[PDB]
């Protein structure tokens with residue numbers, strides 16, 4: 001962006017170190033940065049202290065009927081929209097009555113999960129560049145529409161460079177990754193099959209790192225991940241450790257996700273996920289561990305001693321049949337012991353809970369478990385979806401809070417309807433009765449991308465129609481689903 | 496009102512089979528559903544009407560919509576009179592100095608008991624106009640969120656003001672009166688009796704007599720006890736006699752808090768469910784609010800009596816209550832075949848509606864059991880419709896879209912990104928939608944809400960009368976200085 005903007009009159013949640021809230025607050029931005037944030041009258045002094053040239057073109061946004069938030073940082077996300085017709089998706093009968101416990105449910109089917117994750121590379125290769133771009137753009141637009149200004153890929157069924165291109169075009173921030181799986185649990189062999197050379201998987205991530213260095217927007221970073229500790233060799237783990245030290249990067253993986261994980265890990269690898277990561281030298285401040293609930297006392301102590309990070313998705317565990325909240329209570333207990341814990345959406349093949357829905361879930365579920373309405377305050381849920389997530393992503397230098405020097409990444413929500421009436425804590429009303437759909441305005445680096453809940457830098461109808469066309473092509477050609485099953489569903493879409 | 500055909504959308508019936516019809520239809524004549532099913536089946540029912548009826552048939556195009564039964568919120572309290580005081584409008588915008596209070600940390604049973612015993616005094620200080628203006632706005636919020644049948648389980652309001660508000664808004668209401676005849680005082684080792692049980696019972700009989708004539712089919716009543724802490728044996732035995740004589744449902748709060756059983760034993764010598772069981776109140780009439788802190792014998796009494804539990808998993812966390820995971824008893828009793836419905840409870844400011852509560856149950860019950868099928872989305876719907884109507888003893892008329900039942904239904908728009916390609920729009924609704932996403936509300940075939948707007952109410956007027964009433968009551972009855980109240984009311988974006 002170019003020029004100064006003053007967003008004044010609303011309640012401003014900063015998610016700074018003090019979790020500061022300013023009723024009748026203001027945010028002054030110049031180009032892509034926040035320069036001043038506080039009470040309207042304090043910020044008005046900063047305006048009078050600008051270069052006259054800058055003040056003369058200052059745009060004033062009246063936000064008195066609005067709440068101002070930092071942009072959501074969704075640090076644990078997967079692009080999976082290519083599986084819309086197959087994965088718990090568009091071909092199910094409308095009735096749910098015949099549904100069965102499957103996949104992640106009932107403790108986890110570890111063989112099926114391992115095998116499914118090892119198949120990703122083959123399905124990515126079956127995708128056209130246009131299908132990748134069209135599906136990435138729509139999938140990432142849905143995140144942006146729900147207030148996500150910084151999105152973290154932790155392993156996607158899509159082409160990394162298609163997703164980088166989608167992020168560049170949409171105007172949002174993206175931490176790109178590659179799919180990394182070099183082992184599969186084969187029960188008929190009584191061993192893991194080493195499915196790939198660790199060094200080839202690491203070279204692919206270095207090729208992505210080289211391509212993202214060439215992007216000049218400052219909006220694209222990358223972070224290597226391992227799909228899941230079941231699908232990781234010692235050689236992949238040691239290589240990731242060496243790569244993240246050499247390039248000074250964050251690192252992400254899924255670990256302690258499922259009840260049946262530890263038993264499969266001991267049987268096939270001879271050791272549980274966190275202890276294998278710890279041996280490789282990966283349990284340290286760089287680590288974002290997805291889920292990380294099924295940890296014994298030694299593994300909890302390794303996470304605390306390393307000052308690691310856990311990303312938690314309490315909005316989506318129930319519908320997947322996962323028990324990564326209440327079966328162990330470990331993630332809330334590690335948060336109480338001073339571990340950084342952020343909130344993330346995870347993802348599915350169809351639209352599911354956004355950050356706003358995940359913030360509500362944490363606020364309900366952590367407080368209920370501890371019989372304590374102060375364990376997660378609404379401003380805690382916000383910090384867990386903004387500043388603390390940015391810290392796990394190692395992007396808190398630039399995003400996650402409204403503070404002088406950080407990027408002008410912010411959301412406006414309308415607070416003038418019955419849901420907000422008389423509440424001096426509009427964030428609380430937002431967690432009670434609002435969601436992703438209630439994000440009104442989205443600004444990234446001082447540029448408005450969304451306004452009145454509408455994209456102002458995209459053709460929403462085009463994003464939708466290209467996604468449906470891409471999904472049809474990929475589903476019929478790559479997934480070999482008959483056109484007879486696909487076309488009736490696409491004919492029912494309300495355009 | 497005539498015949499209406501609502502066709503083209505996905506129709507959730509919450510009938511006995513939990514039937515769902517993609518490209519389904521609902522045919523209504525006057526106040527009743529006459530046909531529901533596939534569009535082509537229902538189209539046959541249209542051709543089978545009297546020609547006079549068919550000639551004036553109106554068609555609603557619902558092809559871009561999902562159709563639900565009207566939500567039955569069987570456990571609600573009108574508390575909007577406490578907007579400035581109770582966790583409300585005078586708090587600082589920063590939450591950082593908040594402390595565990597009231598229901599939190601196991602429950603402050605002395606403070607809870609004392610607070611509940613003060614209700615009769617505050618209701619008495621209310622004008623009829625204050626009561627009506629606050630009731631109407633409070634109940635409009637329920638209606639706006641898709642609640643077509645609302646159950647009072649003890650309100651800070653005048654019963655007949657709330658009946659009048661329900662009559663005017665066009666929704667269904669089970670009215671109650673406030674019942675508290677004991678308090679747990681810290682200076683005592685036994686309950687202090689505060690009222691004659693017969694006076695408390697006479698108040699409910701005056702309400703029952705006032706609504707007895709009502710011909711609309713929209714007003715019923717159900718006696719409640721506030722909380723078993725504030726109930727004498729004489730009140731309990733009197734309620735039992737009243738509900739037998741008048742053939743009524745019965746509701747109370749029991750096993751709500753960790754610290755309840757210990758206070759109950761210390762002051763009454765017996766826990767809530769056993770005291771209800773002694774009175775003869777643990778039977779099919781009982782809707783027990785919360786009912787999580789039950790030992791083995793009390794769970795057995797609930798199952799043997801075929802009692803009903805109303806659960807509010809949407810609101811436990813923010814109150815610091817642990818009525819879901821600390822015991823896991825409510826999900827376990829549901830698995831054992833006890834009727835369990837979902838309710839909002841209520842607060843003094845707008846909180847989780849039924850839609851938010853349905854999502855909560857769907858996330859939280861499934862996560863606890865590592866089983867995505869323990870509560871299916873259609874289960875969450877049944878728990879907020881047909882099963883709640885059964886607990887309220889109104890399932891004769893409402894709670895499901897079936898021939899003969901009232902034409903009480905909701906339309907939700909399903910044409911945006913949230914719903915795209917999902918053949919289970921209810922699932923997308925629980926993921927990404929809420930109370931605000933209710934588009935149309937029909938009660939007995941009359942449209943009360945359309946495009947998320949009141950059809951036959953001035954929403955700005957309901958708001959402004961509520962704020963006027965709230966100001967009077969807050970400054971006069973709650974003695975909050977005008978200096979604290981007027982700056983808040985001046986900041987309302989009209």
Ligand SMILES: [Zn+2]
Nearest residue numbers: 078154290346
């Ligand atoms: Zn994940």
Ligand SMILES: [Zn+2]
Nearest residue numbers: 570648784840
């Ligand atoms: Zn209640």
